[PDB]
Amino acid sequence: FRSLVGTSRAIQQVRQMMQQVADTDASVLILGESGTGKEVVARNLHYHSKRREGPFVPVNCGAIPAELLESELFGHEKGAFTGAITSRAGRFELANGGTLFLDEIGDMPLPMQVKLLRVLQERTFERVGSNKTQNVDVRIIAATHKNLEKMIEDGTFREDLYYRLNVFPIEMAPLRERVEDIALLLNELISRMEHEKRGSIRFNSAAIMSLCRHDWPGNVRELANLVERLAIMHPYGVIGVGELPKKFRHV
Ligand SMILES: Nc1ncnc2c1ncn2[C@@H]1O[C@H](COP(=O)(O)OP(=O)(O)OP(O)(O)=S)[C@@H](O)[C@H]1O
Ligand SMILES: [Mg+2]
């Protein structure tokens, strides 16, 4: 785990709710833009859960071939389809006793949403082509940068799955709504980068104000990118307004 650095009320609330849902087995939904810490939040939840010493299993919902998605999620037994010479355990079976992290749940296709639902209310599943219904034991943590209720109304997300998953919602404020945290965030990212052989910089107040007026569409991950790049261009340097890429200058 990392900790969620920062002193905004938003991030403090996020910490409080994390402390409250962690050692429960409730489905957690983390909503937030790209780069805002949603996976951090998930890994932290997990390592402070009953599952904390079982497996943490990510599932990147839009980055699996549909043609194989079922078998990736639920495993297959030999000769289920063409190419099925071995017998795979699925992400779910892999996760039994741990946490399953559905990364971008809004990109999960509908047939997979119903199957996921069957798992959350029944706690069973079968490998593809297989008869044997295995029980399964995981804690669900899903994340999204999408508007799930809108999708519900566009009929691209299932309402029943929605209310089943969204037991404990946690919202992650975008960086541009937490500028108070940027310096802290900086000190963290730089510290990591030092503890990782990888270089050193620091920022002066003008630079820091400039970065505090930036829109951060990639949020914290964009910030981390900037720290790495600047540490290359100005090794062990102090970063002022004129060292920032023009993109990040706001004076
Ligand atoms: N509050 C925070 N304190 C410290 N480090 C953070 C914080 N939030 C994010 N990070 C770090 O900055 C990066 C943000 O990435 P993620 O947490 O994976 O964001 P995300 O919401 O999961 O983005 P996606 O959904 O994968 S595009 C990671 O390298 C984290 O370690
Ligand atoms: Mg992620």
Instruction: Catalogue all structural domains in the chain, each as residue range(s) with its CATH number.
Output: 1-175 (3.40.50.300), 176-251 (1.10.8.60)
| E strand residue ranges, the chain | 28-32, 56-60, 99-103, 124-126, 133-135, 139-144, 168-172, 201-203, 237-239
Q: How many CB atoms lie within 10 A of CB 22?
A: 18
CA of 241 to the centre of ligand 2 (A): 31
CB 46 less than 6 A from any atom of ligand 1: no
Are 178 and 4 in contact by the 8 Å Cβ rule? The answer is no
> Which amino acid residue places its CA nearest to atom 18 of ligand 1?
39
Go through 63-99 and write b for each residue having 16 or more CB atoms within 10 A of its CB, e for each that does not.
ebeeeebbbbbbbbbeebeeeeeeebebbbbbbbebb
CA of 219 to the centre of ligand 1 (A): 9
CB 106 less than 6 A from any atom of ligand 1: no
Structure tokens at 144: 């999204």
3-state secondary structure of 134: strand
Are 186 and 179 in contact by the 8 Å Cβ rule? The answer is no
Are 37 and 172 in contact by the 8 Å Cβ rule? The answer is yes
User: Experimental technique used?
Assistant: X-ray
- The bound ligand whose nearest atom lies closest to the alpha carbon of 41 is 1
CA of 250 to the centre of ligand 1 (A): 24
Resolution in A: 2.4
Angle between helices 182-195 and 205-212 in degrees, nearest 10 = 120
Task: Report how far Cα 42 is from the mean position of its chain's Cα atoms.
Answer: 6
Rounded to whole angstroms, the Cα distance separating 108 from 30 reads 15
Rounded to whole angstroms, the Cα distance separating 58 from 85 reads 25
CB 174 less than 6 A from any atom of ligand 1: no
3-state secondary structure of 89: coil
Are 25 and 168 in contact by the 8 Å Cβ rule? The answer is no
CB 32 less than 6 A from any atom of ligand 1: yes
Residues 18, 22, 24, 27: is their CA dihedral positive or negative? Answer: positive
CA of 102 to the centre of ligand 2 (A): 9
CA of 124 to the centre of ligand 1 (A): 32
